Structures are given as C-alpha cells and as structure tokens.
Amino acid sequence: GDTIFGKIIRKEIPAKIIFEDDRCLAFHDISPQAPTHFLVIPKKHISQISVAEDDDESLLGHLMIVGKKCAADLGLNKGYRMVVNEGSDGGQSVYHVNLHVLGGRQMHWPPG
C-alpha cells in the first residue's frame, strides 16, 4: 500500500528536497539522527530490500551514487554512514525502500 514517502514523491506533502531525477528522490529526514541525515528513495515502490528484484540492481546502486554525491554537496568531507533497514529487527520505519545517509558527527559502533 501507499506510504508517506509516496506522498512525498507525488509532492502532496512537503519535504526539504535535496535532489531529484526521473527515478529517485533525495530529501532531509524529518527526524534527523545526525547533523546531516537525509534519505534517497526510488520512485518505483519497492516496499523493502528483501523483495527487490534482480532487475533493480542498477537502480539500487543509483541510490548509493546519488547518496554519495549529495553527501559531498552537503559538505560531509569527514565521512558518513549509509543505512538500509529491513523489517522489524532492522527497525524499518516506512515500507518504501529508503537509503539513509548520516553525517556531521562521529557515527558509533555497533550501528544500533
């Protein structure tokens, strides 16, 4: 079913958009866990990484390339952490695939 991230893609509710193309959208997370914390999501509604199809491989990599380019544009020259959550144990909060990018502070270990 639809999620709040679908509404964001459709521009029905506001978000602070960082980057957009024909197949993905990057925007700041509304509940930031670091001084910079944004999401990169595909426009295709893949609900979770566990159901991603083989044909989605380059799209998923595109999310990471967009994410790293956005991180550089946002000044994260000391580094950052990328996260994808799956399911209950993964703490996934929205059932639309989303790549978190967090930086601007030391990220710790374990990663949750």
Residues 52-71 contacting a copy of itself, CB under 8 A? 52, 54, 56-62, 64-65, 67-68, 71
**Residue by residue, what is the 3-state secondary structure of 25-49?**
EEEECCCCCCCEEEEEEECCCCCCH
Question: According to the binding rule CB under 8 A, does residue 109 interact with a copy of itself?
Answer: yes
**Cα–Cα distance between 78 and 95 in angstroms, integer?**
30
**Cα–Cα distance between 17 and 25 in angstroms, integer?**
7
Q: Which residue lies nearer to a copy of itself by CB, 4 or 14? A: 4
Site size for a copy of itself (CB under 8 A): 47
CB atoms within 10 A of CB 14: 10
How far apart are CB 69 and ligand 6UR at their closest, in Å? 20
Applying CB under 8 A, the residues found at the interface with a copy of itself are 33-34, 49-50, 52, 54, 56-62, 64-65, 67-68, 71-72, 76, 78-92, 100, 102-112
